[PDB]
Structure formats: structure tokens, C-alpha cells
Symmetry: D2
Subunit: 284 residues, 4 copies
């Protein structure tokens, strides 16, 4: 018999009613988690603001923009910023803060739109390109290897990369997964961008498929006014592999450096970085 009746389809919405799982438990802890960006680190403000300024970057695209924190600063410092993301749940908060602050011209002129790394080319009229494209805070890693061959990773970078104007920069990052795969632990409270305020506990689960590392899945355990859980997954980009992927994205025509945590990275140095930042420039 074993059918499966449902009161509404997965994905739809009705007017008096909270959507899908929006009122649930994981969702409400996870809303604390993403709203955990109040102290932006001064080091990071210094570094990115100085990276852009140093290369004369003024037109910037923030791909994977989230609630928009990184973008809010860019906007604040007089940049010209377009911000995209594929997730409405997070874009809601960019959109919100933008309305909230609509009187400010800098912010009236802020563009927030939906777009998807896999279709980025058709989803953002790039014009003759952007000065900087930033994808920070380790979000590229949310893109999973569904097809098995990393062809998606490849297309996502190719698309992102193509957003970048000649002589422009792509500033893209990932957690040091080399280390995570090594300790088998993804340390909490190590976010170099926004020092975290939530006290939170973390179990790390690593899936290895036919002896190639395939997923890191983090289950967070947070305290409220309470012990609530939620789970997120990541693709573990070892530093070599990502280096290759991202280079190939521009064909090969690039200046390419890779940062420690904002300081440079000499392979075999005593200090172990928590993130690797890839700053890429182009051709001509």
C-alpha cells in the first residue's frame, strides 16, 4: 500500500503559515549561528580594505553573500558593491538591513540579487567585468561534489572567475582542511573574520569515499536560555587541490598568491593557518 499523503508539497508556502521548517529547533539555533557576526575582526577589516585599496578596486561583487556582513562594510567604506547569493533564507537579512538603512545613499545604491554559482554567467550581467570578486568566510566549500568528479567545483570557479575584469582580483578562501583531515577535528571559535560570540560545541564527521575525502559534516551543539543542535556539511578542499582548481579557472592566465590568515604563506612554516585566502589577479 505504502503510499505517502502530504498536506502540501515540499517547497510550497501558504499565507497564514510559517514555511516548511522555519519554526523548528535546528533552524532557530542556526539563526543564532549566522547572526553571530557582531564583532568583525579589526585585522580582517584592515586587510581586505587594504587589499582592495592597494589594487585600485572600486567595483566589487560579493558572490555568496549571506546576510551580507562583508558586503555591509564594503558598502560602508564607499565601495560600489553588488552582492549575490543563491539562498533566500540568508539573503533575507541582507535585504532587511539594506531597507533598514535605505536613507543612506551609499546603501540605496547597494545591489542585492539572487544568483547561483553554477549559472553565474547568465545570472549577473557582468558588464565588461568586476574589479574585485570576493567569496570569503569559506562558502565555496558549501558546494558539494554531487556528480563525483568535481566537475561542479570546476564550473563554479570558472563562472565566479569570469566575473573578474582584466587585471582584477578574485579573493576566495577556504578553511585549512588539510589540517582538519589530519586532526579529524574542525576547531570551533577559529573564525578569523567575525570573532564568535556564541559559546558552541562541535562534532566532526569526515566521510571518505574510495579513499578520497568527500565530506566534512559538522554537528553544532549550542547553548541558549538550553542545549540545541544543528548540522552543516562542507567539501574538504585540501590546499593543493584548490590551488589547481582555482588556477585553471582563469585558464591559467594569473598572478596567484595564497595567504596564511591574512599574512603570507610559506609551505612548511611553523604557523598553521586556520583559513587559506587565495588572491588572484589576471592577464594582458
Amino acid at each position: 500500500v505504502d503510499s505517502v499523503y502530504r498536506t502540501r508539497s515540499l517547497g510550497v508556502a501558504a499565507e497564514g503559515l510559517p514555511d516548511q521548517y522555519a519554526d523548528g529547533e535546528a533552524a532557530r539555533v542556526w539563526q543564532l549561528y549566522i547572526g553571530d557576526t557582531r564583532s568583525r575582526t579589526a585585522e580582517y577589516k584592515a586587510w581586505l580594505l587594504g587589499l582592495l585599496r592597494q589594487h585600485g578596486c572600486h567595483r566589487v561583487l560579493d558572490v555568496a553573500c549571506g546576510t551580507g556582513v562583508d558586503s555591509i562594510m564594503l558598502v560602508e567604506e564607499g565601495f560600489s558593491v553588488m552582492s549575490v547569493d543563491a539562498s533566500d533564507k540568508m539573503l533575507k537579512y541582507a535585504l532587511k538591513e539594506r531597507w533598514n538603512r535605505r536613507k543612506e545613499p551609499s546603501f540605496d545604491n547597494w545591489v542585492i540579487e539572487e544568483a547561483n554559482w553554477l549559472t553565474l554567467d547568465k545570472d549577473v550581467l557582468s558588464g565588461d567585468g568586476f574589479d574585485a570578486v570576493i567569496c570569503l568566510g569559506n562558502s565555496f566549500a558549501h558546494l558539494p561534489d554531487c556528480k563525483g568528479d568535481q566537475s561542479e567545483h570546476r564550473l563554479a570557479l570558472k563562472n565566479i572567475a569570469s566575473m573578474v575584469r582584466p587585471g582584477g582580483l578574485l579573493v576566495i578562501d577556504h578553511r585549512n582542511y588539510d589540517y582538519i583531515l589530519s586532526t579529524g577535528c574542525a576547531p570551533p571559535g577559529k573564525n578569523i573574520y567575525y570573532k564568535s560570540d556564541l559559546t558552541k560545541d562541535i562534532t566532526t564527521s569526515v566521510l571518505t569515499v574510495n579513499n578520497k575525502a568527500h565530506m566534512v559534516t559538522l554537528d553544532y551543539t549550542v547553548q541558549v536560555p538550553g542545549f540545541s543542535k544543528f548540522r552543516l556539511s562542507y567539501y574538504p578542499h585540501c590546499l593543493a587541490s584548490f590551488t589547481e582548481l582555482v588556477r585553471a579557472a582563469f585558464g591559467g592566465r594569473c598572478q596567484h598568491s595564497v595567504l596564511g590568515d591574512f599574512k603570507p604563506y610559506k609551505p612548511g612554516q611553523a604557523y598553521v593557518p586556520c583559513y587559506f585566502i587565495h588572491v588572484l589577479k589576471k592577464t594582458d
Copy 2:
């Protein structure tokens, strides 16, 4: 062993990524369905616009507001409109149009906020009260009877009703479910508010529990192509609803019930598609 590993929890989102089921098939047809409000009927414009005007309503709250089309009109016609809904996916579009139309003052002054019928009291600083409260297009019926006794229907109306300022109006509606339950079929394209544009086909599934009707589930099956989604409804019979909604003000009210915009005399020839309930407060 029968454990169930997931890659993310139900209800969360990550940045590079489309949410949960937003990219799926039923979601895309259903997006067609709710964006199917281009021709608002002139009859409806006339009626509601005239309802509010003859009772001197200016401060109106659109409970369950959706993409916000009713609200867009009220705004446009120089009303002072606050619109709430509990659904982000829907509110997105009111929010969207609003931004889109942000250089018009009438619109800069539009308020769109999240709120839930069951917590509507502590969700909307109601002030003195609102002039009119509209809940149109049959959305009250989206609230299901989960507990089994309709206590939630009751609270929902009580909260809504309390949003209404003394001598003010509640304008709330439901499909003619009495009929729907007589025929067993919910006819397609009878939406008296927004003349539908979409060649759509409908399967009506009625659930009856211990002999009490309990749910209408509609399977909309749409030409894009040949795709489907399903929505469900609590079937309010006219009496039941009239009782519920009256009691919501305790009982201090001027209660009339509309056909489709024209009055309703029980036993009249014409069978209405919707029942509109226009209420005012006496204490």
C-alpha cells in the same frame, strides 16, 4: 541499524546554495500559481475600495498578506497599510515589489513585517487598534486543526479580531466549503479577486475524521508542460465560521456576510464561491 545521516538539518541554509526545496518541481509550478495575480477583478477593486471608504477606514492591517497584492492596492489608493504574514517565501515578493517601488512615498511608508496568527497579539504593536483588518482570498482556511478541537482556529480569530479598533472592521473570507463538501469538487478558476490566467486542472480530496470533515486537499496540475503541487485547506462550513468569528469579539459586533461581494440571503438561487464576513465592534 536504521539510522538516517543528513547533510544539513531540516530548516537551515548555507551560502552558495539554493534552499531546501526551492529549486524543485512543485515549488516552480507553485511559484507560477501565486504569481498568478495580474488581473485583479475590477468588481473587487470597486467593492473593497468602497467598503473601507464608506466606513472611513484609513489605517488598515493586512493579516496574511502574501505576495502582497491586496496590500499593493491599498497602498496605491493612499491608505496607510501594514501587512504581515508568517511566510518568508511569500513575503519575499511584497518586500521585493516594495523595494522596487521605493522611490514612491505612499510605498516608502508601506510596512511589511513577519507575524503569526497564533501570536498576533504579542507580534504587532496594535496601538489604539486598526481601522480595518483584512484577511482576504481564503487564507484563514490555511490554518489547520492540529489539536483536534478547533481551539487554534479560535485563538487565531481572537487575535486577529483584537487587532480591530472600536467601531472598526474585520473583513475576513472563506471559500464556499459547504458547496465544496456537497459536490466533493473544488471548481478551478472561481477566484473572485484575481481572474486566474493559468490553464490549471484540480483534484479534490476531502478528509473526514470520525464523520467530521477535516480537510480539503487540492492537487493543482498545471500547464507550463504537465507539472503538479498540492495544497490543503480546513473546510469552514458557513455556520461554523459565522459562530467562530462572532465569538472572537466575545459577541459585541455588527455582523454581515457577503455573497461574492453582493449580500447573502440564505436559500437564494445564486450559490457563492466565497463568503465574505464584514464585522464591526460595539464594545
Copy 3:
């Protein structure tokens, strides 16, 4: 990302380990429910035993046989009985009691096999047919209308019917759904075959599709050493509709009567039967 990892596939089994949901709650109440056949009613023993004997039936097939209670009696009274069912979970108990009682020749000679109404023809070498085919206790109604047109109902009966030898009988039954659709209540403790011993409570849920009755779904609430629940669904066969279906099954070449509860049925009689039993004979 929203994949869905699983430790084993739906439907498989591993050796140290209880199957799928077999240890769960609904399963354990429901095991009480099906094992609720200790007092077989004397009236029913009298009637069926006398139906078969009256028509000289000795080779009988019990299609949809369950734990095998009806079959156990047939076997006990010196009948020659083949019993089939499509469900291993229930056939386990027929099989069990058959081993348990293996010394008895009557029972050594009991045949229990798997077969499916929809493929019954290929699933049971019918030989030149059976004398009686019994499908009692309202199990035909477990067969749902998945395709929407009742073509399955039609094929299931056609197949069952074809099991019946020329001049033989088909003895098939259904709950009075006419009444159930009417009261909207499926009364508990009304089983005319095995008087029930479990004290149990019942919520009736009727699904009507485009104004045609489509499902009755019963949620049972039982007491143990405890208040445990479980749910079963049924196709509501109104008496006219089933009459038609079953007749057409033999093409039309039949004697056809329909019983009250074991007594005859004159439409419009004061007594409202809880089951309708259809006794069919054939051609020549």
C-alpha cells in the same frame, strides 16, 4: 546540498540485526492485533464448514491467508488446502504453526506458498482448478486503487476467480463499507470470524477523491501492560460496486449469492450486516 545518506537500503537485512522496523512500537501492537484470533466464532465454523461440504468441495485454496487461521481449520477438518499470501511477515506465522504441528499428516500435507493477487495466474500452478477459493476476513480490501481506475481490483479478482474449477466456488467478503461511509465510523469488535479479545479503540478517516470514496484508514489505539497506536488502510467497496467487479471476473458465467453475516441478504431488510460474503459458483 540536501542529499540523504542511509546505513542500509530500504528493504535489506543484515544478520545480527532486527529487520527494518520490526522492533518498533506500531509493529508490536499490530502483532497483538493479528494474533487476536483465538476464539474463532462457532457460527463461522458451522457456516463455512457447511458451505464447502454442501457443494462437495475438498480441494481448496486460501488466497490472502495471513497467519493461516482459516486455513488451520480447513486443514484440521480434513480438507486439502493450499494457502498463499503476498506478505512474509504474516506468512511467518502460518509457516511456524505448520512446523509446530508437522507430525500430523493432515498438516505435513498443508501447502503454504507466496503469491500475489496481481500475478496469481503465474504464481500458483492451478492445475485444472480449485473446488473452493476462499478470501475471507476482508482482505481483498487491502488492495488499493493505485492507478485510479480500479483496473487493479479488476485484475486481482480476474486472477483469483480463474483459480476456481468449473462448478466450483469463490467465497470472498468485504466489510459493509456502505454503512461505514455512511456513519463515517468503522466499528471495532465486530469481526464475525474471530471474536476479538483485545480491547481496542478506533479512529476512522475516510478519503474522498473528486467525490468518489477512495480510502478508509483506521488508526487503532490498543492497551497492553499501556496505550500504543498503529494504522491500516482499506479500499471501501460499496456493495453494488463489488457485486459488479466480482461478477465480471468470471466474464459473467456464474451463480451468485451474497450473504448477510452468514445469513442471506435481502436488500432493504431491517438487519444491517457488518460483512457481505459473496459465494460464487460457475459455468457448464
Copy 4:
């Protein structure tokens, strides 16, 4: 609203009807997989048959017995065999063959009953104790570490072990997971017991939690056609298991560990596919 109506509960069955997922795709390939025991290896016949015989074992309990192939041999060779498993779907087939072969006495006297490692004590009137207890073909590994501390592994062995009569044997095995965890790959067709017949292809997924290996999940992908199923395993490393299984007798034991049937000297050239643990009791 997001309720989930079902037509029957998980775990029940109705009569005209195939159960739950029994007719589905993965179930049919997997039925091929477990019925893939036709050629038992002659080496294995020899070994186990010889193991029991030199230690004068006659009363043997096949814990986790499955379709019952190991058991069918023991029976055939005139042993006195009781076989348990917690899985109906598997037991069906032991039960089946048994009935099929019921006119042979050796078989009429075969006992097949349901029992669960975690409740094995109060599940099997153990009498004085069994001569041998076999749990072969790597089935202990099907018991997962649900609680997180391996306390269930521990109880399971304790119960099993207690089935063993003083001076009697426990013969229990596991794949070489140490290797599996070194390479990351679980090679196909290394089953030392039953020479596989089925051209099958395998994807090895290892789960590591806070740095401790936690699960092997195997995706078998079979030529019938091109279908799939998945099974999971707790990877017992040799030390861990040796510890677990020793402790199960408290510590009163004669413990040896086999290569694939030949002894095992740690650091030897040959890397075994399975580890067989033959234990006896001293008090």
C-alpha cells in the same frame, strides 16, 4: 501545516500485500547477494569441520545464522545445531530449506529460532552451555555503535560468550578492517567462506567521528542489469576486537587468532582478509 499522512505504519503488514519494501529494487539485488552462497570453499569446509572435531564439539550454536548456510553444513555433518538470528527476512531461508529438507532426521532435529545479541541471555535457554558457538562471515560487525562508547559491542560479546560451555569454543570473526582503513577500499570477492559468483562492484565510504573510525558503508553495484544496495559495518581493528572479545569471558580463556584459517603472526608477509578468533574457557 507540515503533517505527514501514511497509509500504514512503518513495520506492519496486511494480507493481500507485499511487505514494506520487499518488492523494491535494492531488496531484489540484495536477495541475489545473500543467495550468493553456492560454492562454499573446500578450505573452509575442511577447517571448521576440523576445528570442531579435534576439540570434540558436538552441540553447537550458530549465533547470527542468516540463510543458514554454515548451519546447513553442521547439520549435514551430523552435528547438533541450534541457529538463531534477529532477522526474519534472513531466517526465512533457513526455515525454508529446513522444511524443504524435513524428511531427513538430521534436519528434523535442526532448531531455528529468533534471538538478539543484546538479549541473547534471556533469549536462548543455554542449558549447561554450548560446545561451540560460531558467529562467522563477519556478522558481528553489523552491530553498530549507536550509544557512542561501544557498550553495546561489549554486551553483545558478553552474551554471546556466556553461551559457551566450560572448555568450549567461541569461533567469531571480522574482516581485516585495519587494512580496509589503511587502503580506504574494501576489495570485492575476498569472501573466504563462499566463493562469490556475482560480478559485483563496490564503493567504500568510511565515516570517521572526532577522529575515531566509526563506520564502513559499502555500496554494492551489481550486474543482473545495473542495480545497487548499501550495507554498513562497524570497522573492528584487530587490537580493539581482541580486547573486546577477551574481556567478554572476564579473561578466563585460550585465545588464538587466525589468518584466513592459517595462524596469524603479527608482521607476517601475508595480509589476511578475515580475522578468525577461536576462544576456549578456563573458568
